[PDB]
Scaffold this active site. Structure first.
Site, PDB file in Angstrom:
ATOM      1  N   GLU A 136      26.358  75.542  44.794  1.00 21.12           N
ATOM      2  CA  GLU A 136      27.120  75.670  46.061  1.00 21.12           C
ATOM      3  C   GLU A 136      26.156  75.596  47.252  1.00 21.12           C
ATOM      4  OE1 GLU A 136      30.166  75.233  46.433  1.00 21.12           O
ATOM      5  OE2 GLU A 136      31.218  75.876  44.601  1.00 21.12           O
ATOM      6  N   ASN A 167      34.857  70.715  54.998  1.00 22.29           N
ATOM      7  CA  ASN A 167      35.781  70.105  54.006  1.00 22.29           C
ATOM      8  C   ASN A 167      36.596  69.025  54.738  1.00 22.29           C
ATOM      9  OD1 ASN A 167      36.193  73.473  52.823  1.00 22.29           O
ATOM     10  ND2 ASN A 167      34.794  71.954  51.958  1.00 22.29           N
ATOM     11  N   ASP A 219      39.745  68.761  54.892  1.00 21.03           N
ATOM     12  CA  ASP A 219      40.949  69.368  55.524  1.00 21.03           C
ATOM     13  C   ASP A 219      40.563  70.028  56.861  1.00 21.03           C
ATOM     14  OD1 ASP A 219      39.734  71.759  54.731  1.00 21.03           O
ATOM     15  OD2 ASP A 219      41.524  72.486  53.691  1.00 21.03           O
ATOM     16  N   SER A 266      38.655  72.680  57.115  1.00 16.78           N
ATOM     17  CA  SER A 266      38.144  74.017  56.768  1.00 16.78           C
ATOM     18  C   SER A 266      36.620  73.878  56.618  1.00 16.78           C
ATOM     19  CB  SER A 266      38.824  74.568  55.544  1.00 16.78           C
ATOM     20  OG  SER A 266      38.495  73.827  54.399  1.00 16.78           O
ATOM     21  N   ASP A 323      33.114  75.715  54.440  1.00 16.48           N
ATOM     22  CA  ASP A 323      32.609  76.617  53.382  1.00 16.48           C
ATOM     23  C   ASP A 323      31.326  77.253  53.903  1.00 16.48           C
ATOM     24  OD1 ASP A 323      34.657  75.656  51.674  1.00 16.48           O
ATOM     25  OD2 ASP A 323      33.280  74.525  50.390  1.00 16.48           O
ATOM     26  N   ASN A 370      35.489  79.546  51.617  1.00 23.22           N
ATOM     27  CA  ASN A 370      36.284  78.580  52.402  1.00 23.22           C
ATOM     28  C   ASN A 370      37.076  79.354  53.470  1.00 23.22           C
ATOM     29  OD1 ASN A 370      37.786  76.406  53.267  1.00 23.22           O
ATOM     30  ND2 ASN A 370      38.379  75.669  51.257  1.00 23.22           N
TER      31      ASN A 370
END
Ligand code: NA
Length: 129
Positions: free
Chosen positions: A35, A46, A48, A50, A52, A59
């Site tokens: 990650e 992301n 969308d 969003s 992280d 998220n």
């Protein structure tokens, strides 16, 4: 902060992640590796819109507030910036909520794709825990 592998293993264990929801410490270290590369300051946008945040790439769509994820929730009741701290307490507390949401560590797509079913014990090998 960029954690050492055994440094992060010790920190995750201290905060009760070892065998949390039945996931051995190596699973959590393997997830953090893919990650964030063990970087607390890691951020990734992301598709969308969003974002992280932190060692476990939590998220903003569901878990933290960043003020720029329209229609999102803040289920860990924390600013997403708290997930970038050198102190992993907020990341671990929030990760406990994520992994308890019903799909276990499949919530982390990189865990499912890169750690699940693999020799995760290798990630805590040689660590004094
Ligand atoms: Na949010």
């Amino acid at each position: 902060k960029v954690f050492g592998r055994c440094e992060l293993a010790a920190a995750m264990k201290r905060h009760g992640l070892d065998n949390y929801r039945g996931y051995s410490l190596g699973n959590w270290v393997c997830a953090a590796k893919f990650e964030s590369n063990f970087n607390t300051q890691a951020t990734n946008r992301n598709t969308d819109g969003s974002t992280d945040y932190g060692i476990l790439q939590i998220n903003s769509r569901w878990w933290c507030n960043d003020g720029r994820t329209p229609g999102s929730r803040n289920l860990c009741n924390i600013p997403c910036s708290a997930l970038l701290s050198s102190d992993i307490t907020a990341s671990v507390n929030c990760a406990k909520k994520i992994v308890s949401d019903g799909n276990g560590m499949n919530a982390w797509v990189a865990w499912r794709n890169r750690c699940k079913g693999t020799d995760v014990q290798a990630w805590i090998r040689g660590c004094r825990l």
